Amino acid sequence: MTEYKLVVVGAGGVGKSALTIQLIQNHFVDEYDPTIEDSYRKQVVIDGETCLLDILDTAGQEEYSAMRDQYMRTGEGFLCVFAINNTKSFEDIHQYREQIKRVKDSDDVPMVLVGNKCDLAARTVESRQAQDLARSYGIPYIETSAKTRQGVEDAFYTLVREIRQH
Numbered sequence: 001m002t003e004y005k006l007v008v009v010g011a012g013g014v015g016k017s018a019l020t021i022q023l024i025q026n027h028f029v030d031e032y033d034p035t036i037e038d039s040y041r042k043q044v045v046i047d048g049e050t051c052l053l054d055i056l057d058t059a060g061q062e063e064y065s066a067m068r069d070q071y072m073r074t075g076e077g078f079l080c081v082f083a084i085n086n087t088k089s090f091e092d093i094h095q096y097r098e099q100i101k102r103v104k105d106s107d108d109v110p111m112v113l114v115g116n117k118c119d120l121a122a123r124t125v126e127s128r129q130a131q132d133l134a135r136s137y138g139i140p141y142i143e144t145s146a147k148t149r150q151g152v153e154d155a156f157y158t159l160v161r162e163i164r165q166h
């Protein structure tokens, strides 16, 4: 079937793993074990089409920036994640976006901007700021909570679909 190779990128602790785990395995990971590189594979139905999701969960910890170029070459689309209660995580998105941009040598890489932890009342990144950033990229912005499951399906399936529009 059609296999979609998604990569989840973003700063440490923003919820990349929890998002992926909630999606593929339908539960919330409450603890924080930093990731190096984990791979997930799951067959799903999106717009009547049975497709395979191949999802690479990546390190947001700087102890692993060197591995970035490899995963950015392979992937067909990137879930670019920050957390809405962490302004520095939002400021970190540019580096990921530019890096992806250089690697693929394209201004038109399938990507989705995700502001995670929208359950948390302690917001410092306004939706408006992220809408403006994503607009400059020509991609969607979608808020999520790995904790409540809010928007998690919309995020990943929107990404799958973005890999289609191209």
Ligand SMILES: Nc1nc2c(ncn2[C@@H]2O[C@H](COP(=O)(O)OP(=O)(O)NP(=O)(O)O)[C@@H](O)[C@H]2O)c(=O)[nH]1
Residues within 6 Å of the ligand: 010, 011, 012, 013, 014, 015, 016, 017, 018, 019, 029, 030, 031, 032, 033, 034, 035, 036, 058, 059, 060, 061, 116, 117, 118, 119, 120, 144, 145, 146, 147, 148
């Ligand atoms: N309240 C809340 N907590 C969240 C959410 N997503 C992740 N967390 C919490 O934030 C912490 C970090 O989550 P994790 O998924 O491990 O982050 P990560 O981006 O994968 N980290 P790393 O880059 O180091 O691998 C965990 O304690 C997790 O429960 C969310 O939507 N809401």
Ligand SMILES: [Ca+2]
Residues within 6 Å of the ligand: 027, 028, 029, 030
């Ligand atoms: Ca749990």
Ligand SMILES: [Ca+2]
Residues within 6 Å of the ligand: 102, 103, 104, 105
């Ligand atoms: Ca390159």
Ligand SMILES: [Mg+2]
Residues within 6 Å of the ligand: 016, 017, 018, 033, 034, 035, 057, 058, 059, 060
């Ligand atoms: Mg992780």
Ligand SMILES: [Mg+2]
Residues within 6 Å of the ligand: 124, 126
């Ligand atoms: Mg402000």
